């Protein structure tokens, strides 16, 4: 059995705003299920051009740090 958090790129988007891409991790493994074992949170600011009154939004994003073989 093995399970690893692997670096990925991921899209952070929101209706009416410009999507950004950030580093995150994804679980990859074979458990003889590979799920997040440690995580944290980040604030990602998206620019929303066109919208003068709310020109940006902060989206809260969970960052996976480590993964492990866990029940279900
Ligand atoms: C995965 O991402 C972190 C974040 O910067 C980086 O420091 C680390 O070296 C990366 N791991 C690999 C295997 O590239």
Curated annotation (Swiss-Prot):
Report the residue ranges that make up the CTCK domain in this protein. Answer: 3-72
| Tissue occurrence | Most abundant in normal lung and meningioma.
Q: Please give the superkingdom of this protein's source.
A: Eukaryota
Disulfide bridge partners, by residue number: 3-34, 17-48, 27-67, 31-69
Compartments, record wording = Secreted
Tell me which family the UniProt entry assigns to this protein. Belongs to the DAN family.
Describe the protein's quaternary organization and the partners it interacts with: Homodimer.
Instruction: Briefly state the protein's biological role.
Output: Possible candidate as a tumor suppressor gene of neuroblastoma. May play an important role in preventing cells from entering the final stage (G1/S) of the transformation process.
Q: What is this protein called?
A: Neuroblastoma suppressor of tumorigenicity 1
Which organism encodes this protein?
Homo sapiens (Human)
Q: From which residue to which, out of the full length, is covered?
A: 33 to 123 of 181
């Amino acid at each position: 059995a093995w399970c690893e958090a692997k670096n990925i790129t991921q899209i952070v988007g929101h209706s009416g705003c410009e999507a950004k891409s950030i580093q995150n991790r994804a679980c990859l493994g074979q458990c003889f299920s590979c799920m997040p074992a440690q995580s944290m949170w980040e604030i990602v600011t998206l620019e929303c051009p066109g919208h003068e009154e709310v020109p940006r939004v902060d989206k809260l994003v969970e960052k996976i740090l480590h993964c492990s073989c866990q029940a279900c």
